[PDB]
Design a protein around this ligand. Sequence first.
Ligand SMILES: [Mg+2]
Ligand SMILES: [Mg+2]
Ligand SMILES: [Mg+2]
Ligand SMILES: [Mg+2]
Ligand SMILES: [Mg+2]
Ligand SMILES: [Mg+2]
Ligand SMILES: [Mg+2]
Ligand SMILES: [Mg+2]
Ligand SMILES: [Mg+2]
Ligand SMILES: [Mg+2]
Ligand SMILES: [Mg+2]
Ligand SMILES: [Mg+2]
Ligand SMILES: [Mg+2]
Ligand SMILES: [Mg+2]
Ligand SMILES: [Mg+2]
Ligand SMILES: [Mg+2]
Ligand SMILES: [Mg+2]
Ligand SMILES: [Mg+2]
Ligand SMILES: [Mg+2]
Ligand SMILES: [Mg+2]
Ligand SMILES: [Mg+2]
Lengths: 139, 117, 192, 45, 41, 97, 26, 211, 176
Amino acid sequence: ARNVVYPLYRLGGPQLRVFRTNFFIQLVRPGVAQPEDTVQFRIPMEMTRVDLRNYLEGIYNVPVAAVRTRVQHGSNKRRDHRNVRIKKPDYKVAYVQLAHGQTFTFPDLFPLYSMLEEERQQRQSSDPRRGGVPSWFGL
Amino acid sequence: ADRMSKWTSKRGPRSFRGRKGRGAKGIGFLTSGWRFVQIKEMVPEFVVPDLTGFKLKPYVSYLAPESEETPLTAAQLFSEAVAPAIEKDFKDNLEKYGFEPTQEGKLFQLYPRNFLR
Amino acid sequence: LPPHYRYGMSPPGSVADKRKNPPWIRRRPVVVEPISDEDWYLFCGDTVEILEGKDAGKQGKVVQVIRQRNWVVVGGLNTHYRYIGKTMDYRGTMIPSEAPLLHRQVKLVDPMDRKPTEIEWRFTEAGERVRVSTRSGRIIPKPETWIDGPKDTSVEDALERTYVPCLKTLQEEVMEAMGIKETRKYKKVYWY
Amino acid sequence: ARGNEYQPSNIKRKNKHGWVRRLSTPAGVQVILRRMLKGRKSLSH
Amino acid sequence: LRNRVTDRYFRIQEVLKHARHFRGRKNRCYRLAVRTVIRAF
Amino acid sequence: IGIRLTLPPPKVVDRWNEKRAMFGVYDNIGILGNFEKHPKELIRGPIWLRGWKGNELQRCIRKRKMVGSRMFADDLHNLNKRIRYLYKHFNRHGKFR
Amino acid sequence: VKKGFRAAFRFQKELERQRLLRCPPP
Amino acid sequence: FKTEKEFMQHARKAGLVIPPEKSDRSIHLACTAGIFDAYVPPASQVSIRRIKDYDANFKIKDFPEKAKDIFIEAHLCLNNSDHDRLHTLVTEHCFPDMTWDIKYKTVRWSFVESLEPSHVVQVRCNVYGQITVRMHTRQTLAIYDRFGRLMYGQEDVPKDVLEYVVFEKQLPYGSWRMHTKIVPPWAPPKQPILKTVMIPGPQLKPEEEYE
Amino acid sequence: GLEEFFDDPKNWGQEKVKSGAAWTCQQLRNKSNEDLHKLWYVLLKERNMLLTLEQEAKRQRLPMPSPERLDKVVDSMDALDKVVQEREDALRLLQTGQERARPGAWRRDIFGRIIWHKFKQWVIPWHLNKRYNRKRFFALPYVDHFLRLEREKRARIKARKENLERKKAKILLKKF
RNA sequence: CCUCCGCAUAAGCCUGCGUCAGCAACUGACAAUUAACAGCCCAAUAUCUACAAUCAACCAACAAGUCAUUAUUACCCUCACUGUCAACCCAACACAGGCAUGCUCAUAAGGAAAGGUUAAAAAAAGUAAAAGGAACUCGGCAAAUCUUACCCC
RNA sequence: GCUACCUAAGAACAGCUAAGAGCACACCCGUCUAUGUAGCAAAAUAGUGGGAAGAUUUAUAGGUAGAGGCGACAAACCUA
RNA sequence: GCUAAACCUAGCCCCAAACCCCCACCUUACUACCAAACCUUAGCCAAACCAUUUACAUAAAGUAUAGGCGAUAGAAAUUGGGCGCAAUAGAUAUAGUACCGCAAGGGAAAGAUGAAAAAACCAAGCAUAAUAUAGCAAGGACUA
Ligand SMILES: [Mg+2]
Ligand SMILES: [Mg+2]
Ligand SMILES: [Mg+2]
Ligand SMILES: [Mg+2]
Ligand SMILES: [Mg+2]
Ligand SMILES: [Mg+2]
Ligand SMILES: [Mg+2]
Ligand SMILES: [Mg+2]
Ligand SMILES: [Mg+2]
Ligand SMILES: [Mg+2]
Ligand SMILES: [Mg+2]
Ligand SMILES: [Mg+2]
Ligand SMILES: [Mg+2]
Ligand SMILES: [Mg+2]
Ligand SMILES: [Mg+2]
Ligand SMILES: [Mg+2]
Ligand SMILES: [Mg+2]
Ligand SMILES: [Mg+2]
Ligand SMILES: [Mg+2]
Ligand SMILES: [Mg+2]
Ligand SMILES: [Mg+2]
């Protein structure tokens, strides 16, 4: 869990246990070409590699073999009308290699106007022989 | 030369980039040869129940009726938790009813929290 | 939203709003008269009557209450004419958009007398509060299915009282439920 | 060659101007107090 | 400013109406027009 | 062009306002109320200049010695500097002497 | 915005005189 | 742009994501996109009762009189550009179709006496009444410029006009207003225009040839 | 499995998905702690699903199908955590009489202001903790002038706000 | 056609010429740098550590030197955290300047002195120059050739 | 964080003749000329030059603070 | 006819009243975790230099006193909301932000539609429209 004071461990103490997990997770699509057995996550900062292993083993029951995380610096180079730096937030990225010869591909997610489009059919464009005469009049 | 930027771990020289980390937690200790010992019991075990046959979905149907907020004060939890035990053992040592004066020998202590969350 | 944000016909989070109210404008704040939260009496669905200007004396129905500016948007009445869908070559279409009214410009309607009425918040034994007109002693009410998906609880299962109130924590109750055992007792640390 | 002057390093910046040094002496404590009374966003390096 | 001058356009136009036929910036700018209008008088 | 293009909104003044209509009442509360009060007790303002007129040096000396104990700190410091400047000005600079 | 009425009034009348001498009425 | 799809695809390529937001106020329209059933010129009494059950005092034997007075008065408001009257006299589907191109030009339309008794033709039907009226009149047009020089039709000479004017009514406060005007494909062409027109051919790119 | 990071694949690209209400708090006070534990993991997996679908919505430059149900899930997570912490607070008040789960003390920093010092866990006692005994919790007498300047600065901000409220009241009486 | 540069690491900077869209690297959205390299170390209490380095051998020194344990007790878990991008830093700048080290010492790497034209004066840099060869000038300064001798300090 | 001196623990110095030696790179400095003078530069450029195994040069951290420091005294240097 | 002009209200000032305000953070602040504080202010300046000296309710009273008895200093007993500002103004403040500085520190500028945007005229400077012998650029004039 995150934003929680962890109880201090002395030698021979009980197992440190988290019951209601504070931190979430999201698996993003890889923007670069990666091996077929690798799932890329966006860990929130206070979550280590061991915690991500036991997190995916416990909750989602995924046979996770390797985890390699890294920290992404969101850019502090964009500015207000006040000329004040806006920081896009930094985020930790997990790279997960799966066991048992499993293979993951990110699935292909995401595969009144009657009046408007029925006046876009009846637009009745001005014939060039009219020369700007309004075509409403029956004369 | 910046002052406004947060002093992150990406920023100093090698000795500064080594010591400061993110909001992660310590799992073990360093020994000679800089060899990291990972203590098994410091790792949080995600205690996860069985989600089989469990009939609570993440949303509630709109046909559920509206009620009032009654936060659990100490008098309510004493009342429904302890008060019929006192009334049944009074019509015929406070530790008999679920009271513990001290909790140093207790596993999950209430003050201070030695459990997590 | 910035201070002295100017409320308008668009909602305070839309896109054409951000064309109209970008984060760098500082405009003269509209002096609106302070109506109390209990003093407001025009609701989204009341049949009201316009007193002033165009469409005076007509009765319509409130469609939107923009309460931060004492605004009542009568549907189909007090309309001006704007185009929409105007591309580069096509001139758009004509639409009767609706101009908002201050609540001073609006009076309610008895559902049996059909007249402009002043309304007070009279108290009765049957109902603690409700609108009561003054020209007649008549109560105006307050104006105004579902199929579950695979991810909704039933109503009965959302209201099960499976809570036996006990002096055990969530942690002790789940450790007793899961059958997890622990013999290592916790060792006292120092807090300062 | 003149004007290059500022020759940066983070160790000399934190150990010259940082918070722990400003709280090492009471003069720098009064510096931090003038920063908070003026209202500045960064009280120290 | 408690009371600062409002009627100042008309003093400038008191002087500058006599300069309307001069050359240069004497017909336009008040600093030059005062000297040439005094001098013309 | 420092002049306005439209005429300003009109200035309505109610001459029979509560303040204007009853203005000046109980100014002669001494000379026909058996001298129980003085009209300098009828004025409201700063406590250092109820019933007193002085120039600026006198207003600041009197302000300091009457309410200067509970003044704010940089108001007390600015006021000490104003008394020191106005001392150096009234007593050393000037034409007539 | 300089408070007052009299310079705004006189300048309002000289704008009226320039509107006359620009577009003279029939 | 040219359509909604180009603005949406440039909203996806530019990255400008517009979430569809839900507002409780929708547009209270007072028109139709054209005609419910287009009358074709050379039994619908159920729709007449479908007008009389909302209106409760409605006489078709008095209606082509009023259809005349709604017609002519609306065209009189083109002589004066009285748009405030026109939105009471004409629908919103008709108002750009008769007032847009006449902007920045003075028309001097003038009615003179009709040739036939005007008469109802068909009637069809949240609830939108619709009455098509046959008129055969004598009108005079004179459409001028910004510069006040004649470009369509003499002011004196009357012309005889066939008119299939479609009316629509909102069925609590609306009245009968000109909705559309059916022009039939068998009709003769209008007046010729005073000036000549050049019509350009295909503007050729250098690699292209004219065929 | 990894398919629980996604919803029912019939919902892919529908641009509108029906969902129920959020778990309000009184509906959760009727439940057991085991039931709030399992429901915590239900809402946890649902929140992760909706967050992957948000980030893929930002990736494909497309809008959300229904962004309101992520707000429903965050509201149900916060409601469940609040109900659990209510039971923690009530049981703590019964057993120990404490109102804060973490011990601390009202202290006074170098800067003279009074700050709630939340205690950290330590192994050794505080008198031989080398890093703790450098952290000084006393204000020396050069601070009291700055405390007085802070007091006067906050009093100026307060007087400005109160007077400005009175000016708005006067302008409201002038207009209506 | 240039290259006395380049490629890395250190320090610095903090996403700053990646994708999509909007004289002739800016904005919005999205994405990425993945530890084996490098930081982040060490259980006490006593007890040991006279003989440089320079190919360390002859030698040859003086300025006299950069490198190590033992006794007993305690000890059994293990691979976490952080850095990793760029055309970059300090000089107000897309500045002929300043910038440590390891490699290549002409490059396998990196770049373009000319927007186009004409061929004035004056100016800058250069190449050549008859005869003479310091006559110039404060002074052989500059340039070209390289040299003799004597004073002062 | 420049610069004056110092502390700690580091580093670089090709080739040729044969030591605070000589020729000579890198590197340090800046004699003399010319360009530049709101410049490329709030002191540079091009060439010529002095030194280049030593009282050398240099990276990193630390120390000395203004009634002062520091100084192979130029009354220098101590953020143009 | 371009640049532009204008604008009224954000706010502020002076009074009165009333005594105010989850997590991480003194190690390299924003980092889960190991053997000590008090010590006269001085000086500018006035004395036409300077050197002792030089101010920091009413009334007695500028009195007694003190003082290179000179500049000057100086008691006590006793007595008892706005004839404010309105965007170069008013706070520096839209903000102690941007930016500058190694740091202490310094320190900005600005906005104006309408009920609803789900609807002209006038500063300088130019342009329309270059110039004609001669001279502080005018004045007397003149048919010009
Ligand atoms: Mg340096
Ligand atoms: Mg190359
Ligand atoms: Mg080039
Ligand atoms: Mg050229
Ligand atoms: Mg020759
Ligand atoms: Mg000679
Ligand atoms: Mg000669
Ligand atoms: Mg020479
Ligand atoms: Mg030598
Ligand atoms: Mg010389
Ligand atoms: Mg040499
Ligand atoms: Mg020296
Ligand atoms: Mg000397
Ligand atoms: Mg000298
Ligand atoms: Mg003097
Ligand atoms: Mg003197
Ligand atoms: Mg007394
Ligand atoms: Mg201001
Ligand atoms: Mg200012
Ligand atoms: Mg002009
Ligand atoms: Mg003359």
